[PDB]
PDB file of C-alpha atoms in Angstrom:
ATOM      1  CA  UNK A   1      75.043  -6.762 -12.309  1.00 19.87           C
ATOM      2  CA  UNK A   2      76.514  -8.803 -14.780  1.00 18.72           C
ATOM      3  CA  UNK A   3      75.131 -12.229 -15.761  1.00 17.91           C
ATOM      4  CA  UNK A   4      76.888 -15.061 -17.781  1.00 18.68           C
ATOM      5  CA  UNK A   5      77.905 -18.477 -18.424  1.00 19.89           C
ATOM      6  CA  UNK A   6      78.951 -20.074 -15.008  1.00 21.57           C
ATOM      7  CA  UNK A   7      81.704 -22.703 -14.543  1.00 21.94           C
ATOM      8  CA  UNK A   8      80.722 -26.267 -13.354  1.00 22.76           C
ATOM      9  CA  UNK A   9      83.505 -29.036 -12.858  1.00 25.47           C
ATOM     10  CA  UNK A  10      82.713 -30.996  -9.531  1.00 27.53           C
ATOM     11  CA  UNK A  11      83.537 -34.728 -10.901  1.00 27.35           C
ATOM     12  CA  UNK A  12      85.492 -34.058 -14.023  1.00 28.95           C
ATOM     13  CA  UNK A  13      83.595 -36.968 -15.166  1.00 28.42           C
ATOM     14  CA  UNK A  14      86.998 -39.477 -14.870  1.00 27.80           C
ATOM     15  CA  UNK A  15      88.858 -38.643 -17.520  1.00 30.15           C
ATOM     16  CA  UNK A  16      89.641 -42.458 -19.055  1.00 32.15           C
ATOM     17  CA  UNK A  17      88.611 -44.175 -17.264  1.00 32.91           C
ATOM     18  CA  UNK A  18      88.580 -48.323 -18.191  1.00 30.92           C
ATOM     19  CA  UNK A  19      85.383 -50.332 -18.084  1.00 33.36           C
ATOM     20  CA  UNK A  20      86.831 -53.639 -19.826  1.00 33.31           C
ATOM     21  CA  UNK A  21      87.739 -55.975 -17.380  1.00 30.31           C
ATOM     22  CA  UNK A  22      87.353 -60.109 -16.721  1.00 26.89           C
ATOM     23  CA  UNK A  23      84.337 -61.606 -16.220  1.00 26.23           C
ATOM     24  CA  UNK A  24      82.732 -65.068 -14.793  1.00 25.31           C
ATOM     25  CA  UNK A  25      85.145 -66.596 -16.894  1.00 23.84           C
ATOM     26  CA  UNK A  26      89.060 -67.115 -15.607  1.00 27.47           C
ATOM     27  CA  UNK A  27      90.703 -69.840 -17.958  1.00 28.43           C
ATOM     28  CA  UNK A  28      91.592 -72.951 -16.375  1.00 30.26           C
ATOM     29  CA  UNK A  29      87.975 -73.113 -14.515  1.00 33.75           C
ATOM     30  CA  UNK A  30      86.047 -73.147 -17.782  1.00 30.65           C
ATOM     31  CA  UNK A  31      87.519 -76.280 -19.024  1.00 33.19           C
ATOM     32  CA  UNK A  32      86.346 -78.055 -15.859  1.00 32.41           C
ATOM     33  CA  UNK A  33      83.108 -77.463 -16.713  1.00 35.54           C
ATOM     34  CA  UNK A  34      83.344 -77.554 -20.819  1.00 35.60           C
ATOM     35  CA  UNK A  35      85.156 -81.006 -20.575  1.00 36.53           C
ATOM     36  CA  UNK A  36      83.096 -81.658 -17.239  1.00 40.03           C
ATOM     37  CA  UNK A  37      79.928 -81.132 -19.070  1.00 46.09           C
ATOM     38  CA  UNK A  38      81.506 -83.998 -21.904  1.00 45.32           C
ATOM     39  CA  UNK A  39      82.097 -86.439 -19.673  1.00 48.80           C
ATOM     40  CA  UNK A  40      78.470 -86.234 -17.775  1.00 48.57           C
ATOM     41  CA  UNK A  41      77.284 -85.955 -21.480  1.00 47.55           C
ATOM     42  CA  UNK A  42      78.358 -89.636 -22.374  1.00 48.72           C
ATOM     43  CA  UNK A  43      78.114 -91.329 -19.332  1.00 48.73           C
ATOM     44  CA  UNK A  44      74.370 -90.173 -19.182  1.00 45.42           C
ATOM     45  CA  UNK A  45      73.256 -91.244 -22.882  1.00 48.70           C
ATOM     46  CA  UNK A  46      75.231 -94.509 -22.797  1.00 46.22           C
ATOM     47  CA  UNK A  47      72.807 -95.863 -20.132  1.00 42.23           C
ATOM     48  CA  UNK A  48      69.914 -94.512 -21.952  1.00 43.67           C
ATOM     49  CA  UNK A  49      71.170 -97.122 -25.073  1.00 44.26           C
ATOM     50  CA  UNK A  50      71.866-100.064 -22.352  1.00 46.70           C
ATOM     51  CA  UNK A  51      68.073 -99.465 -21.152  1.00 46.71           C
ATOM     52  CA  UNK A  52      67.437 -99.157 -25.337  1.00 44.31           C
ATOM     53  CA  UNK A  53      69.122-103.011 -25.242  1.00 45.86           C
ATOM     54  CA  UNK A  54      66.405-104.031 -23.219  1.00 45.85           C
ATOM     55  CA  UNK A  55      63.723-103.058 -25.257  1.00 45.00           C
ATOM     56  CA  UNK A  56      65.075-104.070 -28.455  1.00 45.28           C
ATOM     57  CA  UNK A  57      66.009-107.855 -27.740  1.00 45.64           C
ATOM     58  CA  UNK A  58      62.364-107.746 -26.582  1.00 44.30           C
ATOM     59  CA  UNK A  59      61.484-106.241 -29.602  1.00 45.43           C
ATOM     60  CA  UNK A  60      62.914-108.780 -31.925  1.00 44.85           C
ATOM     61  CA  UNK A  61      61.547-111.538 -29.710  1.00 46.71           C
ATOM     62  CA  UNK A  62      58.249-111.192 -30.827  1.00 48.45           C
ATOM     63  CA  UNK A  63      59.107-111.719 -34.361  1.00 46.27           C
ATOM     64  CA  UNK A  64      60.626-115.255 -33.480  1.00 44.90           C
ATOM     65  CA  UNK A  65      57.885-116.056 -31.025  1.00 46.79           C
ATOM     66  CA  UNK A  66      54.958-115.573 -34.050  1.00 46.19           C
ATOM     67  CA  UNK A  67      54.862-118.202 -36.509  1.00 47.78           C
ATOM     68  CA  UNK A  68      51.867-118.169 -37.213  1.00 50.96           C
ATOM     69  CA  UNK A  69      52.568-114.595 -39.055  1.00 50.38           C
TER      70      UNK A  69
ATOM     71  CA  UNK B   1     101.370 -29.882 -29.035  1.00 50.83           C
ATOM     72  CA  UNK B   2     103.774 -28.161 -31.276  1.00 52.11           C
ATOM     73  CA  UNK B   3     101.872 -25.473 -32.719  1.00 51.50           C
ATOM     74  CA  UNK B   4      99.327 -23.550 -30.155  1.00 49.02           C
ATOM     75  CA  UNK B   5      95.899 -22.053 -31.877  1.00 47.66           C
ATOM     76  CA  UNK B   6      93.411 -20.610 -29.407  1.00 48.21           C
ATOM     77  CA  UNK B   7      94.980 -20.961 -25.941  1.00 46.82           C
ATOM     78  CA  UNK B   8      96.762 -24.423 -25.877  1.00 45.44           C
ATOM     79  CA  UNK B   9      99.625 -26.092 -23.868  1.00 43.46           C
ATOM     80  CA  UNK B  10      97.649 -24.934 -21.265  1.00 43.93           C
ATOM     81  CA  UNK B  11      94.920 -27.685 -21.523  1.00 44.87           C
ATOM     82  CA  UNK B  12      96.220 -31.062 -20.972  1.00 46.15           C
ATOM     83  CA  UNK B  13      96.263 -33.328 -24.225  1.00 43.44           C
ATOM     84  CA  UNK B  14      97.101 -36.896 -24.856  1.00 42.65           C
ATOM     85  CA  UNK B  15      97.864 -38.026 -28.740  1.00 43.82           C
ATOM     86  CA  UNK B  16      97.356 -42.016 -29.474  1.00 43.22           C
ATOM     87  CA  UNK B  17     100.164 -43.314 -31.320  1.00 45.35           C
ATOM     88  CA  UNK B  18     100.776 -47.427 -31.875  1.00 48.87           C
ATOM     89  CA  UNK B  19     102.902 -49.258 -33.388  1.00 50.38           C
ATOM     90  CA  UNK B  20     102.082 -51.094 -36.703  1.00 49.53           C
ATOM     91  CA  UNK B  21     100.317 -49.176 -39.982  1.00 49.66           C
ATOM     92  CA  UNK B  22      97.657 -51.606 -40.259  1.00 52.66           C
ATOM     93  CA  UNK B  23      93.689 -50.901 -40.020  1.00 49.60           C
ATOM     94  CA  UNK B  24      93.604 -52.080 -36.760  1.00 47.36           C
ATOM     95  CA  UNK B  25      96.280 -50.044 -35.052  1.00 46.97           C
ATOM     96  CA  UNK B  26      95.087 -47.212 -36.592  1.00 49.49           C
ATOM     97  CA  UNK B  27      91.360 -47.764 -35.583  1.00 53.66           C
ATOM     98  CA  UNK B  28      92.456 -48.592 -31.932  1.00 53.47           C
ATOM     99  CA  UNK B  29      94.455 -44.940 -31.380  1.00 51.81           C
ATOM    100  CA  UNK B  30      90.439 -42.996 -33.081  1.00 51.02           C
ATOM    101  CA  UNK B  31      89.184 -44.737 -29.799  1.00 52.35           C
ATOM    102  CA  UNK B  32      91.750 -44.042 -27.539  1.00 54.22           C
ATOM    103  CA  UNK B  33      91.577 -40.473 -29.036  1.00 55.26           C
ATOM    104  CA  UNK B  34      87.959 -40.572 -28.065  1.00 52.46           C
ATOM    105  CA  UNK B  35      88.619 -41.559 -24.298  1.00 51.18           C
ATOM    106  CA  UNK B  36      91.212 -38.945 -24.059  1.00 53.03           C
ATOM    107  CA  UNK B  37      89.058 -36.399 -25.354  1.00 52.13           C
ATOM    108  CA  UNK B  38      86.297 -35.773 -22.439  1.00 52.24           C
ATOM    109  CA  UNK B  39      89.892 -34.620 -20.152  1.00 52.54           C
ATOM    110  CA  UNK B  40      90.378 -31.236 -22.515  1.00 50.69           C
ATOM    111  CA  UNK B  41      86.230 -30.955 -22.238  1.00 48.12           C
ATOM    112  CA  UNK B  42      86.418 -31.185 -18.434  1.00 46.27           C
ATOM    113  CA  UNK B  43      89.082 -28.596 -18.328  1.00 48.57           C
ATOM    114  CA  UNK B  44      87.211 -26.024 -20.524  1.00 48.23           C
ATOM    115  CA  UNK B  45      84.477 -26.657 -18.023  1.00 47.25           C
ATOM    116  CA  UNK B  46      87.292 -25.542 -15.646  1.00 46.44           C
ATOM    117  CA  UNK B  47      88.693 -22.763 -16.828  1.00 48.77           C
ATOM    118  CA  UNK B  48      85.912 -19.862 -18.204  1.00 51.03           C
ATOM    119  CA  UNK B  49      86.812 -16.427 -17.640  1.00 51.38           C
ATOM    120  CA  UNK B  50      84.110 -14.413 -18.324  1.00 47.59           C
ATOM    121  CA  UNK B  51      84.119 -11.486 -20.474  1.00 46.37           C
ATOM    122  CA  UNK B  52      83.742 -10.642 -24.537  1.00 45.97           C
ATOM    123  CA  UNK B  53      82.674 -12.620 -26.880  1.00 46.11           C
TER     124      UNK B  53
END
């Protein structure tokens, strides 16, 4: 008997097969959040500086209330 | 495709040509040479007749 290299195909392993495709991203969906992420940036820090206001009228208060400094 | 060396025509081949001589173009067909490459390895997995080496 006669023994040698034996043939093996059974996928073909896809020949080219493409792999790139979209992801998460789409287009007009990112800018709803990238410009939606802008406009709860300002609105949030704005009313930090309003609550800011209240401490620093208080602040320079104290500076007319001591005369005796 | 034109001129056969050790059994050809018979495998299936696929040759990458673009468009434009730039670096890119001719970077882009190396690759797509590369992903038509495993098809002629697949069909020598295919076709072995066994005999003399």
């Amino acid at each position: 008997x006669x023994x040698x290299x034996x043939x093996x195909x059974x996928x073909x392993x896809x020949x080219x097969x493409x792999x790139x495709x979209x992801x998460x991203x789409x287009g007009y969906s990112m800018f709803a959040v990238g410009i939606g992420a802008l406009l709860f940036g300002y609105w949030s820090m704005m009313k930090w500086n309003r609550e800011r206001r209240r401490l620093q009228i208080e602040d320079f208060e104290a500076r007319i209330a001591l005369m005796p400094l | 495709k034109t001129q056969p060396y050790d059994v050809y025509d018979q495998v299936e081949f696929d040759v990458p040509i673009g468009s434009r001589g730039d670096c890119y173009d001719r970077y882009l067909c190396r690759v797509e040479e590369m992903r038509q490459s495993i098809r002629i390895i697949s069909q020598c997995l295919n076709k072995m007749p066994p005999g003399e080496i």
